Inverse folding.
C-alpha cells in the first residue's frame, strides 16, 4: 500500500529581492492541478549513418506550474511576484530575482529544493467561468536546478 | 585490339596439335588476360610493385571490412587493356570460400 | 550499397586511413551523413548556325562533405590536426566507396545548448588531382629514372686541399 | 630520425656495461624525449622561456578549469620532434593526484 495522496503538501517560495524571507503556498486550487511539471528532457539521441545511435546532453528547463484559489493570499503574493519587472533590480552574477521553491510533499518528508529560477507566466486578472465561479489561477515558473530531493 | 599467347589452366604456353603458338585476339584474349591479372599477388612485378591484387593484406587476413579487397580486385580487372569497366562484381563469403564473380564489359 | 557480402556482424562503415603509414585516424568520430559530390565543366561553343558544340570535358576535383559528432576532446584535437596536416593525403572509405588522395579543405565545429557533451562538426575534404593516378615504381634501388636538378650555382667553402687530403687519409 | 643519449629515471646520463653512452634512435628516443619534455617547468629555458609546462599557473594552483593545463601539456608533447600529434590525452583528477595519460602517435 503506497500512499500517493497530496493533502498536506506545502510550498515555500523565497525570492532574491521581492520576497527575501519568502511566503508559503498552502491554498491550492480545486479545479486545476495544484502542481504540474513538464516532462524533463536532459538527454538527446541522434542517428549515425550506419544505423547506430548516439546519446548526448541537452539543456533542460523545469517548467513547473502551481495552481491557487482566486483571491487568496497566496494568489496575491504570486501576482506581486509576477508584476515585478527584472529591470528594476541590481545585477549579480546570479539570476535576476533568483527565486527558489522548497516543496514539502506530504508529512512523509519529501523535500524538493528547486532553485535558480524565476516566474514566467500567469494570469494578471481573474477570469469568471460560465458557471459563475472564478477560475483557479495557474502560475508557471521555470527553474535551472532540480537537485536536492530527499526520500 | 588485344592479342595474347594461348595458355591453359596451368598458366603455361600450351601448344596446338601442330606445335605452333596460337595468338588469341579480342574477347578470348581479354578474358585470358583478366584471369591472369586476377591471379597475381601484389609486389610481384619488379617494374610496377604497386600493381596486383592484395591477396595477403586485403584478402586472407583478419580484417574488418572487405571494401579494400573489392577495390583491389576492381583495379586489377580494370588494369587490363580494353576492359572499360565492370558491369557486376560479387564478393560473396561462404564459410571458408571467398567467392568472387565478375561481369567484365570489355569492348570488342 | 550492395556488391559485397561481408557476412560479418561487426563491419565498420567509415574509415579515414592515412595513406602513408596506413593507419586509422580519428577513429572515434560518430558520422551522420556523407555527401561525395563530383564536378566537371563543359565547353559550350556556339558557332555560326544555331548550334553549340560542347568540345571536351575537364574533370574538376571531387569534394566530400562529412557531418559528424565528435564525442571527446582528443577526437576534436585529432580533427584540428587533420586540418593542420599539410603533408599527408588521406583515404576515405565511406560505404564501399574508396577515395584516395583526399585532403581536408574545411572544418566547422559547432557548440550549442542542444548538445553539451559532444560537438557537431562538418568536415570537408577535396581530392588532389594528379597527372597519373596509377604511377609506375621499381622494386630495387638500382633502377630509378634519372632526376635532373638543372643549374646549381655551386656554393663556397674555405678548406684548402690539405684538409680534404687529411679527411681522405682518415 | 631523432636520437638521444640514454638517461635513467633519475634523468641523468646512464652508461652501458662497457662504460659508453648509448644513442637511442626513433621510437625509444622519442618516448624519452617526450617524458623529459613533460618534466620541464615553464620559464626554465634561458633560450625559450615561453616553452615548458605550466606546473605552477595551470597545475598545482587553484585553477578553475584544467583545459589550460591540457593545452600546456599538449604543447609540451608536440614540441618534441617527430610527434605529429596526440591520439588521446586523459587529464583525470584523483583525490590529490593529477593523473595525465598520453597516446602520442609519433611518426616512427
Amino acid at each position: 500500500m503506497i500512499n500517493v495522496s497530496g493533502f498536506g503538501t506545502g510550498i515555500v517560495i523565497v525570492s532574491a529581492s521581492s520576497f527575501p524571507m519568502g511566503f508559503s503556498l498552502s491554498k491550492f486550487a480545486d479545479d486545476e492541478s495544484p502542481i504540474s511539471s513538464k516532462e524533463l528532457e536532459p538527454f538527446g539521441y541522434e542517428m549515425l549513418y550506419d544505423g547506430g545511435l548516439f546519446a548526448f546532453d541537452k539543456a533542460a528547463p523545469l517548467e513547473v506550474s502551481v495552481s491557487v484559489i482566486a483571491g487568496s493570499e497566496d494568489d496575491i503574493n504570486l501576482r506581486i511576484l509576477l508584476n515585478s519587472k527584472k529591470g528594476s533590480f541590481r545585477f549579480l552574477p546570479g539570476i535576476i530575482p533568483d527565486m527558489t521553491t522548497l516543496v514539502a510533499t506530504l508529512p512523509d518528508g519529501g523535500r524538493t529544493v528547486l532553485s535558480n529560477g524565476t516566474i514566467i507566466k500567469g494570469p494578471a486578472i481573474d477570469t469568471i467561468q460560465n458557471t459563475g465561479r472564478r477560475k483557479g489561477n495557474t502560475y508557471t515558473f521555470v527553474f535551472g536546478s532540480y537537485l536536492g530531493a530527499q526520500t | 585490339s588485344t592479342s595474347t599467347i594461348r595458355t591453359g589452366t596451368n598458366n603455361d604456353i600450351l601448344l596446338d596439335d601442330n606445335g605452333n603458338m596460337v595468338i588469341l585476339r579480342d574477347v578470348e584474349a581479354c578474358a585470358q588476360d583478366v584471369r591472369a591479372a586476377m591471379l597475381m599477388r601484389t609486389g610481384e612485378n619488379i617494374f610496377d610493385v604497386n600493381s596486383g591484387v592484395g591477396y595477403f593484406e586485403y584478402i586472407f587476413s583478419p580484417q574488418k571490412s572487405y571494401d579494400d579487397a573489392r577495390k583491389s580486385i576492381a583495379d586489377a580487372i580494370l588494369s587490363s587493356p580494353d576492359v572499360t569497366g565492370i558491369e557486376q562484381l560479387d564478393i560473396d563469403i561462404t564459410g571458408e570460400v571467398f567467392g568472387v564473380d565478375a561481369k567484365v564489359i570489355t569492348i570488342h | 550499397m550492395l556488391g559485397i557480402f561481408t557476412s560479418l556482424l561487426s563491419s565498420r562503415s567509415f574509415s579515414i586511413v592515412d595513406q602513408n603509414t596506413n593507419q586509422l585516424v580519428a577513429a572515434d568520430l560518430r558520422i551522420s551523413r556523407v555527401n561525395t559530390r563530383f564536378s566537371s565543366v563543359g565547353q559550350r561553343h556556339m558557332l555560326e548556325d544555331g548550334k553549340t558544340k560542347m568540345d571536351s570535358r575537364t574533370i574538376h576535383p571531387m569534394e566530400i562533405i562529412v557531418e559528424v559528432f565528435c564525442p571527446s576532446i582528443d577526437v576534436v584535437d585529432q580533427i584540428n590536426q587533420l586540418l593542420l596536416d599539410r603533408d599527408t593525403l588521406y583515404k576515405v572509405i565511406t560505404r564501399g566507396m574508396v577515395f584516395e588522395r583526399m585532403m581536408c579543405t574545411s572544418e566547422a565545429l559547432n557548440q550549442t545548448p542542444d548538445m553539451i557533451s559532444a560537438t557537431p562538426a562538418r568536415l570537408t575534404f577535396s581530392q588532389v588531382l594528379v597527372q597519373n593516378p596509377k604511377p609506375i615504381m621499381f622494386r630495387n634501388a638500382g633502377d630509378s629514372s634519372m632526376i635532373d636538378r638543372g643549374l646549381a650555382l655551386a656554393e663556397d667553402v674555405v678548406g684548402s686541399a690539405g684538409d680534404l687530403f687529411d679527411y681522405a687519409v682518415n
